[PDB]
Structures are given as C-alpha cells and as structure tokens.
Amino acid sequence: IVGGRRARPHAWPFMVSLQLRGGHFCGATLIAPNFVMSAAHCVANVNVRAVRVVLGAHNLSRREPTRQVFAVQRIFENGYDPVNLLNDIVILQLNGSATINANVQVAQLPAQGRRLGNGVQCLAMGWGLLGRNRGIASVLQELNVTVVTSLCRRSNVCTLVRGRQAGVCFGDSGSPLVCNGLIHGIASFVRGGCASGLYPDAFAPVAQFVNWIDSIIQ
Amino acid sequence: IIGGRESRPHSRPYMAYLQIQSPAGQSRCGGFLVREDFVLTAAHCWGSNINVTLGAHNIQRRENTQQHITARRAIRHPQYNQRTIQNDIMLLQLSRRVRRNRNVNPVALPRAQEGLRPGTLCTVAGWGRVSMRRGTDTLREVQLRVQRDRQCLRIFGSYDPRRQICVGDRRERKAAFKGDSGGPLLCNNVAHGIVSYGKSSGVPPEVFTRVSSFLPWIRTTMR
Amino acid sequence: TRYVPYTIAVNGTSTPILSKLKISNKQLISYKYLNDKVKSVLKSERGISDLDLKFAKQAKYTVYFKNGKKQVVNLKSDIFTPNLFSAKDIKKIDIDVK
Ligand SMILES: *[C@@H]1O[C@H](CO[C@@H]2O[C@@H](C)[C@@H](O)[C@@H](O)[C@@H]2O)[C@@H](O[C@@H]2O[C@H](CO)[C@@H](O[C@@H]3O[C@H](CO)[C@@H](O)[C@H](O)[C@@H]3O)[C@H](O)[C@H]2NC(C)=O)[C@H](O)[C@H]1NC(C)=O
Numbered sequence: 001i002v003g004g005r006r007a008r009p010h011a012w013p014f015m016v017s018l019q020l021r022g023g024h025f026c027g028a029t030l031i032a033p034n035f036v037m038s039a040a041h042c043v044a045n046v047n048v049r050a051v052r053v054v055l056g057a058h059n060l061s062r063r064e065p066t067r068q069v070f071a072v073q074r075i076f077e078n079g080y081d082p083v084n085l086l087n088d089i090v091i092l093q094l095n096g097s098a099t100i101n102a103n104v105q106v107a108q109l110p111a112q113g114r115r116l117g118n119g120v121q122c123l124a125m126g127w128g129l130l131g132r133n134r135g136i137a138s139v140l141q142e143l144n145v146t147v148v149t150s151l152c153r154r155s156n157v158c159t160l161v162r163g164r165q166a167g168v169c170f171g172d173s174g175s176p177l178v179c180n181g182l183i184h185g186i187a188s189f190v191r192g193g194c195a196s197g198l199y200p201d202a203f204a205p206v207a208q209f210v211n212w213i214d215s216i217i218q
Numbered sequence: 219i220i221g222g223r224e225s226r227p228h229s230r231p232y233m234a235y236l237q238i239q240s241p242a243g244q245s246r247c248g249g250f251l252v253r254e255d256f257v258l259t260a261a262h263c264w265g266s267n268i269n270v271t272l273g274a275h276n277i278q279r280r281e282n283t284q285q286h287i288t289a290r291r292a293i294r295h296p297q298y299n300q301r302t303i304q305n306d307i308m309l310l311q312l313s314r315r316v317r318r319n320r321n322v323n324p325v326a327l328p329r330a331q332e333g334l335r336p337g338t339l340c341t342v343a344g345w346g347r348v349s350m351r352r353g354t355d356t357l358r359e360v361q362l363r364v365q366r367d368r369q370c371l372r373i374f375g376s377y378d379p380r381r382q383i384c385v386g387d388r389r390e391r392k393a394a395f396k397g398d399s400g401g402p403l404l405c406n407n408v409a410h411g412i413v414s415y416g417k418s419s420g421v422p423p424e425v426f427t428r429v430s431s432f433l434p435w436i437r438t439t440m441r
Numbered sequence: 442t443r444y445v446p447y448t449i450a451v452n453g454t455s456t457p458i459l460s461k462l463k464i465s466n467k468q469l470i471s472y473k474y475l476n477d478k479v480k481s482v483l484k485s486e487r488g489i490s491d492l493d494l495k496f497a498k499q500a501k502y503t504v505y506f507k508n509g510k511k512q513v514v515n516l517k518s519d520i521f522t523p524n525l526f527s528a529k530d531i532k533k534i535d536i537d538v539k
C-alpha cells in the first residue's frame with residue numbers, strides 16, 4: 001500500500017497474510033473458519049504445500065501470539081483466465097479451522113450480483129510495498145479509495161485516490177477491498193506501475209462470485 | 219557442443235575457458251591462445267572481470283595442468299555492434315604471460331585475407347552444453363561443414379560474408395551451443411573462425427567471425 | 442545473491458553464451474523487478490533500448506519455475522499483478538524480442 005496509513009492493531013481481523021519461507025507474498029480474506037479467499041494469480045505458480053496462511057497478524061516483523069498459522073488442504077477456482085485476468089479468485093481450504101476471537105474473525109460478503117457505482121468509498125489494505133519499488137510493510141496498512149467506472153472494465157471493481165499517487169502495490173495481490181463492511185474486491189492488477197495516479201487499481205469483483213463461493217464453503 | 223565427441227585431453231592446448239563477471243551477472247565462454255600474452259574470443263563475452271583458464275580438460279576439476287590468469291585488458295573491436303552482432307571479436311591481454319608447455323600453446327591464425335571454400339570440413343571445440351538438458355565437464359569438439367554464403371544470407375538479416383563465415387549443414391544435428399561462444403573454428407589446425415551467433419533453436423547454419431578479416435586490427439592491438 | 446540462467450533471442454537469433462542474471466534473494470521480488478533486470482540486459486547485451494521495445498512487434502520473457510510452471514510476461518505491457526514470489530524458485534528466464 002502506497003500512500004496509506006497504518007491500520008489499528010487487529011482493526012481488520014479477517015485480514016490474512018499468505019507467506020512462503022521468504023515472507024509475505026500475497027494477502028487473503030478469511031471467509032469461514034477453514035477457508036480463505038485470495039487472487040488466483042497469487043498461487044498459479046507457487047508450490048502450494050509451502051504456503052502458510054497466517055491469521056490474526058498485524059506487525060509481520062514481530063512474533064505475535066495472536067497469530068494462527070495453517071496450511072492449505074485444497075484449492076478451488078472457477079474459470080481463472082490469466083491472459084485477460086478474469087475470475088481472478090481462489091479459495092484455499094485450511095488443514096483445520098481457526099479459533100474465532102477478537103483477532104481472528106470471518107468477513108461478511110455481499111449478495112450475489114451486487115454492483116458498486118462510482119463514488120462509493122472503500123478501504124484497501126495489505127502488507128505490500130510502501131513505495132513503488134520500496135520495501136514491504138511490517139505493520140498492516142490501509143488506504144481510503146473510491147470506486148470509479150472510468151478507465152475500468154465491467155468485469156472488475158476499480159478504485160482510485162483522486163490526485164494522489166497512491167494505491168496497492170507488490171504484495172497486495174489477494175487482499176480484500178472493504179466497502180460498507182462487505183468484502184467487494186480482491187486485489188488483482190495495477191496499470192502504469194503501482195500508484196500511477198492516473199489509472200485505477202483493479203479488484204476481482206467478489207459479488208459476481210458469491211454463489212460459487214457459497215457452493216464451496218457451506 | 220551438440221552432436222560431437224569428447225576431445226582427447228590436452229589435444230587442443232590453445233583452448234581457453236573464460237569466466238566473466240559484471241554487476242549484472244556471470245557468463246561462461248570459450249576462447250583461444252594466439253600469443254603467450256593474448257587470448258582471442260568474441261566481443262559479446264565482454265564483462266568487467268574475466269578469469270582465463272588454459273591447459274584444462276575437465277573444467278570442474280582443479281587439474282595440475284591448468285594455468286589461471288586474469289585478463290588485464292578486455293578489448294572489444296571498436297565497431298562491435300551488439301544488435302547486429304557485427305565485428306564480434308575481442309582480445310584479452312593476459313595479466314601475465316603463460317608458461318608454454320605441451321598443455322598450453324598458442325594456435326596459428328590464417329594469412330591476410332585468407333578465405334574458406336564452402337564444403338571445407340572444420341572443427342569447433344568448447345565446454346558448452348550438449349543439448350537443452352545436459353552440460354559437459356570436459357572439452358568436446360565437432361566437425362562442421364562450411365556453407366555457401368547464401369545459407370546465412372537468406373536467414374540472417376545482418377550476415378556479412380566479408381567479415382563472417384557461414385558454418386554448419388542444416389541437415390546434421392551438429393553445432394556450437396550455450397557456452398561455446400568465442401571458441402575457435404579450426405581448419406587444418408588454423409583458427410579461421412570465432413563462435414559468434416546462430417538461431418536460438420540451435421538449428422544450423424551458424425555464424426562465425428572470420429578471423430582473417432580482422433588481422434590488421436589484431437596485429438595493431440597486440441603489436 | 443543468486444544467479445539465474447537466462448537467454449536472449451532477437452528475431453530468433455542469439456549468441457551461444459552461458460549466461461546468468463544476478464537477482465536478489467534478500468527479499469521476495471516482483472515482475473516489475475524482473476522487467477527492469479530484463480530490460481537492462483536487453484540494452485547492454487543486444488543493443489535493445491526502451492524505445493526500441495515500443496517499436497518491436499513482440500517483446501516478452503518467460504519465467505520457468507523449478508516446479509514446472511511458467512509465467513509469460515510481456516514487456517510492452519504496463520499491467521502488473523501486485524504479487525511477490527521467491528527468486529530461489531526460478532529455474533531460468535528466456536527473453537524473446539521480434
Ligand atoms: C476513510 O475510510 C474510513 C472507513 O471506511 C468505512 O469503513 C470501511 C471498513 C468500509 O466499510 C468503508 O466502506 C466505510 O466507508 C471512514 O471512517 C468512517 O467515517 C464515517 C464518517 O466520518 C464514520 O461515520 C460516523 O461514525 C460516528 C461514530 O464513530 C457517528 O457518530 C457518525 O454519525 C457517523 O455515522 C464511520 O464510523 C467511520 N468508520 C470507521 C470504520 O472508522 C473515513 O471517513 C474515510 N475517510 C475519508 C477521508 O474518506
């Protein structure tokens with residue numbers, strides 16, 4: 001997150017960090033005690049057995065007893081298209097269930113087909129880079145963004161910070177976009193580099209996949 | 219080398235193994251001794267520091283016959299064009315003269331403007347890969363046929379027969395490959411060519427710098 | 442802190458050099474990182490500059506991963522997925538410009 005601010009500790013208890021050995025590589029969202037949701041492109045090329053799902057984290061650079069670490073038991077996708085970045089969504093089943101507490105909680109999803117109009121105010125978040133080639137975050141960051149339709153596609157939810165070279169950056173793939181308490185996006189791609197200040201960021205539209213998600217997790 | 223055979227150890231005592239480093243990465247090339255103080259190779263093997271090994275057969279073993287000498291100057295041809303790969307020739311001035319013996323010995327260069335008729339069988343040698351999947355620890359070699367120039371002229375936009383050689387029968391799976399860059403083309407025990415470029419598939423023909431076209435620059439540079 | 446085998450092909454032609462890119466393994470890297478490394482050796486080794494790439498019909502590289510997966514990344518595109526991955530997992534990188 002470029003141009004954001006630090007989130008309050010465990011302000012967003014559905015926020016997930018996907019990690020390899022070398023550290024955080026993508027964000028995700030806890031959608032059930034044993035399921036998280038992320039971008040399909042985050043895991044397309046990784047060794048899934050080596051992925052660790054970290055719940056209840058805040059400062060990735062410190063040891064946190066609030067954390068609960070899981071492995072991936074199974075992958076679910078629905079028509080991912082890496083050439084056109086359509087349906088850029090993946091559900092990872094955990095090898096166990098989280099224990100739900102103040103620091104680890106399930107997110108609320110919109111109803112199927114709900115479409116956000118331009119001007120809706122949202123919050124992006126994640127542990128991605130703080131500048132367009134700078135270092136990844138230690139403390140989870142959050143950013144006020146606005147839904148825009150101009151320079152977007154109908155197949156995405158796009159967001160912009162007017163007049164500011166701010167937005168998601170490397171390591172924010174997979175992280176939720178929270179609008180009105182609901183997860184409406186999954187960070188999917190940027191245009192013109194991170195924080196162009198010209199082109200909005202693009203999120204996988206969660207509401208378009210809600211029936212498929214419910215197929216999986218219930 | 220693709221489709222060739224392992225060289226008799228120390229049968230090509232001029233062969234040089236080059237380890238090139240730059241801030242951007244590392245490269246491995248071949249070369250050949252032309253005087254006790256000079257190794258010839260390709261300009262596209264240039265880098266900030268070059269370590270030269272003479273007298274090697276197995277480059278993965280520290281053989282007693284080896285001599286390790288850094289390059290004091292790495293002199294690309296002043297008109298080398300790395301896009302067209304023209305004038306792809308470079309002289310390495312060694313930081314000390316080699317100790318001449320049965321295992322380390324210079325190779326002769328052709329005479330002024332000496333050509334090479336199509337059909338002539340020549341040999342290229344090197345420590346490059348033998349396929350997409352397999353390397354080599356020891357020196358290998360393969361015989362290749364010189365082609366008429368039309369073979370390279372039709373597929374390489376920038377091929378210049380006045381400064382380059384068209385080498386390799388397209389029907390034979392025989393070629394220099396990754397790591398052979400800079401190695402010599404030997405005809406009658408004279409280094410006529412320097413491994414330069416080819417198609418990325420490794421399918422023949424390939425292009426060699428024609429050593430004899432650069433003898434004035436070579437002599438001027440070595441003096 | 443890690444060297445990755447790589448090749449360049451321009452209109453199908455390459456030099457038969459055994460070459461490795463230095464790429465950091467101190468942290469996870471991105472495709473924007475690799476774009477910069479790839480464009481740098483396109484310029485230094487084959488005289489292919491940023492502006493040359495605007496005019497190229499195609500300009501891409503493929504990242505071959507050790508697990509058998511590959512990722513093609515066009516150089517003429519400024520669309521990036523904001524993910525990270527480990528340099529230690531890359532097997533080789535083939536660059537191709539036409
Ligand atoms: C930046 O974004 C924050 C948070 O955005 C809100 O929460 C996210 C989790 C998503 O659900 C977004 O869709 C949603 O917009 C904004 O903070 C919010 O500000 C509003 C208005 O100031 C607050 O509403 C008020 O709440 C007080 C009590 O605290 C009431 O008395 C008022 O009557 C009024 O309802 C809201 O509480 C607050 N939400 C949170 C979670 O802090 C923020 O305004 C926004 N800033 C900018 C400049 O865009």
Ligand SMILES: *[C@@H]1O[C@H](CO)[C@@H](O[C@@H]2O[C@H](CO)[C@@H](O[C@@H]3O[C@H](CO)[C@@H](O)[C@H](O)[C@@H]3O)[C@H](O)[C@H]2NC(C)=O)[C@H](O)[C@H]1NC(C)=O
Nearest residue numbers: 049051052053054067068069070071072073094095096097
């Ligand atoms: C699901 O996967 C997670 C992620 O690895 C597991 O968490 C791990 O749990 C073990 C205890 O079972 C922790 O101890 C370690 O066990 C291994 C043997 O598997 C042992 O070799 C180590 O020396 C260590 O003691 C481990 O620290 C913990 N991993 C993390 C990152 O905290 C979890 O157990 C799995 N759940 C199920 C139900 O299988």
Ligand SMILES: *[C@@H]1O[C@H](CO)[C@@H](O)[C@H](O)[C@H]1NC(C)=O
Nearest residue numbers: 237238239240267268269288
């Ligand atoms: C030159 O030799 C030294 C001494 O062993 C070695 O450290 C270095 O890596 C070599 N240089 C290159 C460019 O390989």
